Amino acid sequence: NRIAECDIRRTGLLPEHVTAFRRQGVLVVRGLLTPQELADVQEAGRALIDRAWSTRSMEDTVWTLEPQPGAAPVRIEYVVDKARPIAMLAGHPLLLRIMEQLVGPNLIPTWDSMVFKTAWHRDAGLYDNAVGVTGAGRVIDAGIYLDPAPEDNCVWCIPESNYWGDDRLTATADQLNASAVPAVMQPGDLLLHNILTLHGAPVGKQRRVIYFEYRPAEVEWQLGPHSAEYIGLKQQVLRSCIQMRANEPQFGDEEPFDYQPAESLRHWVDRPEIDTLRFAHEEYWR
């Protein structure tokens, strides 16, 4: 059974899309980025990877082997704090109007990164009774694609596996890894998946995806995985990116996302106006 598709600039996010996402754990969104923004983010992506090779450092960068013959960077962490177009991407109103419907009005940006890879699994940050807490799709990985992902080389999902118990999840994944539907993507498209959805990929050309994860503040507040202070800082981060993007004249015609969480969840005055967009998870863990 196919992965539902939202042509976002054509229809908006329809109830059917929302329902598809909640049931199957995944949703394909076509044409998120305009031609111009796609190129801007492609370029920021290009420069960040180049700088990783030249500056063979592991600062916020995952390497296959130590910068050893055949070593390569495959991931940069906190890319929103590293490139101006990506920070502005983090405040994209179509993306965030979607995240608001799916995660709720108390959404906060958690992980942000860019993966450029050269196993079936769920993503991390699991809770006790994870399916009880977020089988419905409240903790969401936003994959914004800079390069094509053809059926040869794309992520595969097992729909509805976001409601699977631990035992069946583990048993099925072990079978699958020892020995499904594809998200076939064009640049500027967005893949949304529930972190509880079993996904994975099987000999191809380098691909780039920017990942934004989102959680409800009230889930973080009570269950983690971050510390309580973290909520307010990522709220400033979200508000800053929306601000930055709003003040950019190529985006002047966009109606900015109106971030309005419940009163008791507004925590951005709590701290002084932040210096950085980078907040290391290990420094804000519980």
> Binding of its own copies at residue 5 (CB under 8 A)?
no
In whole angstroms, the minimum distance from the beta carbon of 141 to Ni ion comes to 7
> Binding of Ni ion at residue 123 (CB under 5 A)?
yes
Contacts of 59 (CB under 8 A, 6+ apart): none
> Binding of its own copies at residue 13 (CB under 8 A)?
yes
Binding partner of 168, given Ni ion, its own copies, none, CB within 5-8 angstroms per partner class: its own copies
Q: Helix/strand/coil (H, E, C) string of 186-230?
A: CCCCEEEEECCCCEECCCCCCCCEEEEEEEEHHHHHHHCCECHHH
Among 37, 100, 189, 213, binds its own copies (CB under 8 A): 100
> Binding of its own copies at residue 218 (CB under 8 A)?
yes
Percentage helix, strand, coil for the chain under 3-state DSSP, each rounded to 5: 40, 20, 40
Interatomic CA distance for residues 122 and 213, integer angstroms: 14
Stretch that binds Ni ion, among 108-116, 121-129, 178-186, 264-272 (CB under 5 A): 121-129
Sheet with 26-30, side-by-side order of all strands: 5-7, 26-30, 190-194, 140-145, 209-216, 107-115, 73-77, 61-63
> Binding of Ni ion at residue 201 (CB under 5 A)?
no
Parallel, antiparallel, or unpaired for β 190-194 and 209-216? Answer: unpaired
Residue 61 vs 106, nearer CB to its own copies: 106
Is residue 114 within 8 A of residue 142, CB to CB? The reply is no
> Binding of its own copies at residue 101 (CB under 8 A)?
yes
CA neighbor of 108 nearest in space, from 255, 268, 245: 268
Interatomic CA distance for residues 205 and 85, integer angstroms: 24
Among 82, 92, 138, 207, binds its own copies (CB under 8 A): 138
Query: Which amino acid is it at 9?
Result: R
Interatomic CA distance for residues 203 and 20, integer angstroms: 31
Binding partner of 169, given Ni ion, its own copies, none, CB within 5-8 angstroms per partner class: none
Binding partner of 261, given Ni ion, its own copies, none, CB within 5-8 angstroms per partner class: its own copies
Binding partner of 123, given Ni ion, its own copies, none, CB within 5-8 angstroms per partner class: Ni ion
Which residue number has the CB closest to Ni ion? 123
In whole angstroms, the minimum distance from the beta carbon of 199 to Ni ion comes to 6
Binding residues for its own copies, per CB under 8 A? 13, 15, 18-19, 22-23, 97, 100-101, 104-106, 129, 131-133, 135-136, 138, 160, 162-165, 168, 216, 218-219, 221-223, 260-265
**Positions in the binding site for Ni ion (CB under 5 A):** 123
